[PDB]
Amino acid sequence: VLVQDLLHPTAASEARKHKLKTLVQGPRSYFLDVKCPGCLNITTVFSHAQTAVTCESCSTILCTPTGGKAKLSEGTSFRRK
Amino acid sequence: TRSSVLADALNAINNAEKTGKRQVLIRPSSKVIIKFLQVMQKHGYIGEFEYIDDHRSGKIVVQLNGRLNKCGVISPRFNVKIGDIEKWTANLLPARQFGYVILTTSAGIMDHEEARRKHVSGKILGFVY
Amino acid sequence: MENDKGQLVELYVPRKCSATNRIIKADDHASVQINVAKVDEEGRAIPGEYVTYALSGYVRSRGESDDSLNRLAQNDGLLKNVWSYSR
Amino acid sequence: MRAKWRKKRTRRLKRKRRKVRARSK
Amino acid sequence: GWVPVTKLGRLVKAGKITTIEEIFLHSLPVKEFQIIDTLLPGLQDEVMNIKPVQKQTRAGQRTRFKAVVVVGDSNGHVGLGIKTAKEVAGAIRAGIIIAKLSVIPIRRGYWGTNLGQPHSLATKTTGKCGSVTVRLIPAPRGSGIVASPAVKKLLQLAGVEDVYTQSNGKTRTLENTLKAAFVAIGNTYGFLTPNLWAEQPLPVSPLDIYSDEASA
Amino acid sequence: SLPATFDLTPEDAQLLLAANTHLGARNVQVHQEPYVFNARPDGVHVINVGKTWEKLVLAARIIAAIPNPEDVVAISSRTFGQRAVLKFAAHTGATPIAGRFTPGSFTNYITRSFKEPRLVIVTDPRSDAQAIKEASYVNIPVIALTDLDSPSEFVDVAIPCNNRGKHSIGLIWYLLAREVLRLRGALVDRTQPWSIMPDLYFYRDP
Amino acid sequence: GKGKPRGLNSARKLRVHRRNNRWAENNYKKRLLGTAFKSSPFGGSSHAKGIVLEKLGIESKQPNSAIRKCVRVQLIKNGKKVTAFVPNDGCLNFVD
Amino acid sequence: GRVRTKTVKRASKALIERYYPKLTLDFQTNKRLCDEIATIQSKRLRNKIAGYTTHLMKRIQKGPVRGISFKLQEEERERKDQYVPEVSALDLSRLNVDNQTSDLVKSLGLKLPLSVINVSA
Amino acid sequence: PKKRASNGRNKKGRGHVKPVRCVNCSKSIPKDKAIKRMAIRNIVEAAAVRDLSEASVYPEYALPKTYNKLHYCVSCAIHARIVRVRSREDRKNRAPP
RNA sequence: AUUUAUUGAAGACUAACUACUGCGAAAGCAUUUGCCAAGGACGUUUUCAUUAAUCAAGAACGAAAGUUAGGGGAUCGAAGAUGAUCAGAUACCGUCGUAGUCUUAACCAUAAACUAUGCCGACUAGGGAUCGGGUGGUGUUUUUUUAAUGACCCACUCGGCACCUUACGAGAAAUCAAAGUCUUUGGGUUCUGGGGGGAGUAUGGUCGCAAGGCUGAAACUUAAAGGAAUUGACGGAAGGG
RNA sequence: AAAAAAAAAAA
Structure with missing residues (x-):
């Protein structure tokens, strides 16, 4: 473009871009707090778990892994933290 | 591999001014580079520049005139x-x-x-x- | 430049492409000189009241002439939100 | 001529010289 | 009678345009050796070498001669012209013409201590045409033009008094050598320096000024 | 700056969005164009007609900055633009060129179509890319009507428009001629709507 | 990196590479192998005394037709057979 | 062959473009006005020119011809050009716009009617 | 010198292609350089198809077809009046007619 | 006999799908199914913490042909035998056909082994498509109208095989997004070359069962060899007349 | 899609 601001660009482009090629590399992941039906025992969880997470009170299931974002069980109420 | 960060920086700068650009993004922002640009700027070759403190190594952005x-x-x-x-x-x-x-x-x-x-x-x- | 005692030398102090502060050669036959007319109190054009902009063959070849001109105009005030320093 | 054939010829010659020098030694 | 067909030639014949300085300042396209001879009458021509060429056909070898010519006033102006033609006189003629049309300025300078009346170039400048690469370094006074005969004639006609040359390539192709020197002394004014960092107000075009006494 | 009478009026907007000039190219794009606005589904991209209007007024300012209108040129090899440029030539000096360009019309001074302009205008640069080549050879600026995909190299002022649209082309030409007359003082009232017709500026198939 | 090293401590590499490419030259190879002292009938000298053995009507290479009136000599310090040219019109009669 | 040269074609072209309200589709009378109106050094060339002009006027009597232009033709051209409607279809027949376009109008802050239609993929 | 950035063929990133045989001269050649065409043809001809359908029970049957993929090599192709030769620029052109 | 039909045995090959597609360090790799162990890319608000880049010497793998010993030995087929052709034809074409082609256990260690472009890294123009992964979208479809998936569409992104256009740049040019950022000559690094021939020859070494490889000159001789392109001429090269 | 070899050198 031959002229532009490389210090105050748009969050549009900066969320479009990779997580490293921005002005400052930062993660695109997030955490959740999840409730399963029955025992509340609310559980903190990562988005990209790599694991099969379960509740401490009951071994029911919370989420399952993937190569990307995890796949939460069908009946589970999640809140982005 | 990457050994002369300074050389890579100056190469990017020469390429930018060749293209006629007036800004350029630098990586990874060390002391000798800061002082080198301080001299260049003092003599009036470039203009202003900003250090960005990513907590890794630092980046730099440089506003360029055409005197280079x-x-x-x-x-x-x-x-x-x-x-x-x-x-x-x-x-x-x-x-x-x-x-x-x-x-x-x-x-x-x-x-x-x-x-x-x-x-x-x-x-x-x-x-x- | 000039000699020991003023007395300018260096005939043909040349022009400079504005978007780059870059010298325009004598034979940059793709360079151009634009003259934008002013307007005053009616909208009508004034003759001999130009805002000038010179440009070089490199810029015009890379096609960035349009955007450089847009930003120059918006800086000189004869344009508006068209350009954005933030892409 | 072709290098393939010059090379083949030369190899046969080297072989022959090897064996006659074997006669001597 | 000249009788131009050009805004530029019309303005010149009328006397509004009076300097190739204005011309080069506006980077104007020039199409008339009449214009150039009107502006810089004090120039000399010089034929450098004449090599013939040949084309092969059914019948014999159609030969025509290629003339290369320098023109200059030795206060900072030169031009270079090459032409192929079936006859030597017309070759030299059109070579003179094309040189006059290719005329360009020179940014002379000082090796140091800008005493007066520049002797040499300002900067180190190179030029390339095919294999050849000519380099031109500024020299002190009395050093003289250190170069081959052809480049020496070229720089004399440019008005340079002293210079050092460090060259490379098949320099025996005078075409490429002279074109390289041409390009280098063009890069002189193509080069930027602190005494030209100063910004200027972009003067206006003589065409826009004298547009009334222009074409019609 | 401007007196603000030169802002886009809703009537001009009605004409523009009737011609659907804002309906530019498809997901095709040239990165020399941030003029887009909220790209539409169906793989279609929409234009800032405000920026279109501003650039149009700018081109008008330049054309009025010319002393001698004949030194401005109209190029339209395009059938959809020949009539438009001819009416431009009628209502201005505006030496036009329809049909063929005849290369060597800016150079080769001997030629009968030899012109020496201080400015040129283009209906579509991809189709008119010869005359801009000669302009680059001979130190001349450029005015062009681009879509979001046109070859913006060797191009000074460029106006985003739907050059695929007959009515879009003729409308833009109408607007430009009108603004030039307004700035020259021929047309007196900026509020005057200028009875003349884009239908006159348009093309006809028979 | 243009191949060659550039480190501030690589002069060894550079020297030895020079030595080997110098061997790739001609004159260095010659001077250091002592071809002249060991061949080239002279002792690497310029001139040499000799004794005529006989005379010759050596023919010319092409494109040309000539007989070049040379002689055969037995150089002394080596005892070596050589041919040598007698340049002028009729000196072969003076050098019997 | 019976093919004709650029001399003939150019001559007939000029004669037609500036003597249209004149010579008709008869070779004999065209020939007579030809050797009346222009100088030609041969009867044969005259005849060829007259015949080609006749063929051209046949084309004209049925349809215009590329490369040619006489006063009547250019007059009809500029007239059919200057034709315009008295309705200006640009003028409203009821207007439609996309949702993106309505958003554009809003961002511009302007007063306009809209008949928004939904464009689906 | 180099006449073709593809050099004859369609190999960029393999090394080896396990060739096939040109049918007209039984000649080995890789599958990426081979000329491949395909000949799909009605079995009989548009001339005698009428005689067939006239002397045929099972009316409107199908007129089935024969399909065969043909690998020719360069020499046999140019002899059989195929890809014959092109100038430089249209040698760069890659699409069919 | 050929040919047709029904069967069985043998051994190789893995069609069509099969492409400016994939993997692998290269050579190279294609039926299915399973076992073994490995690998890249992607994701990661996981860990270590500069361990890294290229590298002599020294090591592993290394098409085909070839060699040794066993098995196998269907095709095709160096040699060889034969029928033609031709002035001749132990050459082209045709028919046979040992070795070999295949495999196990060992050797050989080369190749137009080619992208004729050493590796690592950075930056520099546009455009779209594709493979793997990932993200977002009330998007479309499939199920149980519905869900979740899966497959397709749109946008984005990382990493790949590549590709189209221009040349700002480069180059002897052909051409090149690297063969650019190099007379304004320096990011790091290994290897190689110094007119052509003789000569990758001789000798001496060393490796190998051998064939041969790797290393590797001299004498002597020569003024031109050669590269890229131009215009012609020519063609048992094509197209048109 | 039988056949069809050779032409001293010099400029």
């Missing part, structure tokens, strides 16, 4: 004495009047006329005009 034809580097950082300065300049500069050679001395980084004024010598890094 070639900012360069000398790998290896050669050892240089007080007449070697003159013959170096005669080799790598366009004329006797303008253009500056840069060299780290024990008394900090500076250009060759300043090092003449101080009567001190050391390790040539690069040059600019």
Whole structure:
């Protein structure tokens, strides 16, 4: 473009871009707090778990892994933290 | 691999000014680079520049005018004495009047006329005009 | 430049492409010189009241002439939100 | 001529010289 | 009678345009050796070498001659012209013409201590045409033009008094050598320096000024 | 700056969005164009007609900055633009060129179509890319009507429009001629709607 | 990196590479192998005394037709057979 | 062959473009006005020119011809050009716009009617 | 010198292609350089198809077809009046007619 | 006999799908199914913490042909035998056909082994498509109208095989997004070359069962060899007349 | 899609 601001660009482009090629590399992941039906025992969880997470009170299931974002069980109420 | 961050920086700068751009993004922002650009800016070749403190190594952004034809580097950082300065300049500069050679001395980084004024010598890094 | 005692030398101090502060050669036959007319108190054009903009063959070849001109105009005030320093 | 054939010829010659020098030694 | 067909030639014949300085300042396209001879009458021509060429056909070898010519006033102006033609006189003629049309300025300077009346160039400048690369370094006074005969004639006609040359390539192709020197002394004014960092107000075009006494 | 009478009026907007000039190219794009606005589904991209209007007024300012209108040129090899440029030539000096360009019309001074303009205008640069080549050879600026995909190299002022649209082309030409007359003082009232017709500026197939 | 090293401590590499490419030259190879002292019938000298053995009507290479009136000599310090040219019109009659 | 040269074609072209309200589709009378109106050094060439002009006027009597232009033709051209409607279809027949376009109008802050239609993929 | 950035063929990133045989001269050649065409043809001809359908029970049957993929090599192709030769620029052109 | 039909045995090959597609360090790799162990890319608000880049010497793998010993030995087929052709034809074409082709256990260690472009890294113009992964979208479809998936569409992104256009740049040019950022000559690094021939020859070494490889000159001789392109001429090269 | 070899050198 031959002229532009490389210090105050748009969050549009900066969320479009990779997580490293921005002005400052930062993660695109997030955490959740999840409730399963029955025992509340609310559980903190990562988005990209790599694991099969379960509740401490009951071994029911919370989420399952993937190569990307995890796949939460069908009946589970999640809140982005 | 990546060894002369300074060289990569100056290469990016030369490519930008060749394209006629007026801004450029630099990586990874070390001290010698800061001082090198301080000198260039003081003599009026570029304009302003910002350090960005990512907590890793630092980035730099540089606002450029068109007063720059070639900012360069000398790998290896050669050892240089007080007449070697003159013959170096005669080799790598366009004329006797303008253009500056840069060299780290024990008394900090500076250009060759300043090092003449101080009567001190050391390790040539690069040059600019 | 000039000699020991003023007395300018260096005939043909040349022009400079504005978007780059870059010298325009004598034979940059793709360079151009634009003259934008002013307007005053009616909208009508004034003759001989130009805002000038010179440009070089490199820029015009890379096609960035349009955007450089847009930003120059918006800086000189004869344009508006068209350009954005933030892409 | 062709390098393939010059090379083949030369190899046969080397072989022959090898064996006659074997006669001598 | 000249009788131009050009805004530029019309303005010149009328006397509004009076300097190739204005011309080069505006980077104007020039199409009339009449214009150039009106502006810089004090120039000399010089034929450098004449090599013939040949084309092969059914019948014999159609030969025509290639002339290369320098023109200059030795206060900072030169031009270079090459032409192929079936006859030597017309070759030299059109070479003179094309040189006059290719005329360009020179940015002379000082090796140091800008005493007066520049002797040499300002900067180190190179030029390339095919294999050849000519380099031109500024020299002190009395050093003289250190170069081959052809480049020496070229720089004399440019008005340079002293210069050092460090060259490379098949320099025996005078075409490429002279074109390289041409390009280098063009890069002189193509080069930027602190004494030209100063910003200027972009003067206006003589065409826009004298547009009334222009074409019609 | 401007007196603000030169802002886009909703009537001109009605005409523009009737011609659907804002309906530019498809997901095709040239990165020399941030003029887009909220790209539509169906793989279609929409234009800032405000920026279109501003650039149009700018081109008008330049054309009025010319002393001699004949030194401005109209190029339309495109059938959809020949009539438009001819009416431009009628209502201005505006030496037009329809049909073929005849290369060597800016150079080769001997030629009968030899012109020496201080400015040129283009209906579509991809189709008119010869005359801009000669302009680059001979130190001349450029005015062009681009979509979001046109070859913006060797191109000074460029106006985003739907050059695929007959009515879009003729409308833009109408607007430009109108603004030039307004700035020259022929047309007196900026609020005057200028009875003349884009239908006159348009093309007809029979 | 243009191939060659550039480190500030690589002069050894550079010297030895120079030595080998110098061997790739001609004159260095010659001077250091002593071809002249060991061949080239002279002792690497310029001139040499000799004794005529006989005379010759050596024919010319092409494109040309000539007989070049040379002689055969037995150089002394080596005892070596050589041919040598007698340049002028009729000197072969003076050098019987 | 019976093919004709650029001399003939150019001559007939000029004669037609500036003597249209004149010579008709008869070779004999065209020939007579030809050797009345222009100088030609041969009867044969005259005849060829007259015949080609006749063929051209046949084309004209049925349809215009590329490369040619006489006063009546250019007059009809500029007239059919200057034709315009008295309705200006640009003028409203009821207007439609996309949702993106309504958003554009809003961002511009302007007063306009809209008949928004939904464009689906 | 180099006449073709593809050099003859369609190999960029393999090394080896396990060739096939040109049918007209039984000649080995890789599958990426081979000329491949395909000949799909009605079995009989548009001339005698009428005689067939006239002397045929099972009316409107199908007129089935024969399909065969043909690998020719360069020499046999140019002899059989195929890809014959092109100038430089249209040698760069890659699409069919 | 050929040919047709029904069967069985043998051994190789893995069609069509099969492409400016994939993997692997290269050579190279294609039926299915399973076992073994490995690998890249992607994701990661996981860990270590500069361990890294290229590298002599020294090591592993290394098409085909070839060699040794066993098995197998269907095709095709160096040699060889034969029928033609031709002035001749132990050459082209045809028919047979040992070795070999295949495999196990060992050797050989080369190749137009080619992208004729050493590796690592950075930056520099546009455009779209594709493979793997990932993200977002009330998007479309499939199920149980519905869900979740899966497959397709749109946008984005990382990493790949590549590709189209221009040349700002480069180059002797052909051409090149690297063959650019190099007379304004320096990011790091290994290897190689110094007119052509003789000569990758001789000798001496060393490796190998051998064939041969790797290393590797001299004498002597020569003024031109050669590269890229131009215009012609020519063609048992094509197209048109 | 039988056959069809050779032409001293010099300029």
